UniProtKB/Swiss-Prot annotation:
Function, as annotated: Suppresses the insulin receptor and EGFR-transduced MAPK signaling pathway, but does not inhibit MAPK activation by a constitutively active mutant Ras. Probably impairs the formation of GTP-Ras. Inhibits Ras-independent, but not Ras-dependent, activation of RAF1. Represses integrin-mediated cell spreading via inhibition of TESK1-mediated phosphorylation of cofilin.
Family recorded in the similarity comment: Belongs to the sprouty family.
Domain comment as written in the entry: The Cys-rich domain is responsible for the localization of the protein to the membrane ruffles.
Disease named in the record: Hypogonadotropic hypogonadism 17 with or without anosmia: A disorder characterized by absent or incomplete sexual maturation by the age of 18 years, in conjunction with low levels of circulating gonadotropins and testosterone and no other abnormalities of the hypothalamic-pituitary axis. In some cases, it is associated with non-reproductive phenotypes, such as anosmia, cleft palate, and sensorineural hearing loss. Anosmia or hyposmia is related to the absence or hypoplasia of the olfactory bulbs and tracts.
Assembly, per entry: Interacts (via C-terminus) with TESK1 (via both C- and N-termini); the interaction inhibits TESK1 kinase activity. Interacts with RAF1. Interacts with CAV1 (via C-terminus).
Localization of this protein: Cytoplasm; Cell projection, Ruffle membrane
Stretches of the chain forming a coiled coil according to its record: none
Protein's name according to its UniProt entry: Protein sprouty homolog 4
């Protein structure tokens, strides 16, 4: 699953 690193 795709986890993005920092908002």
């Amino acid at each position: 699953n795709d986890y993005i690193d920092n908002p």
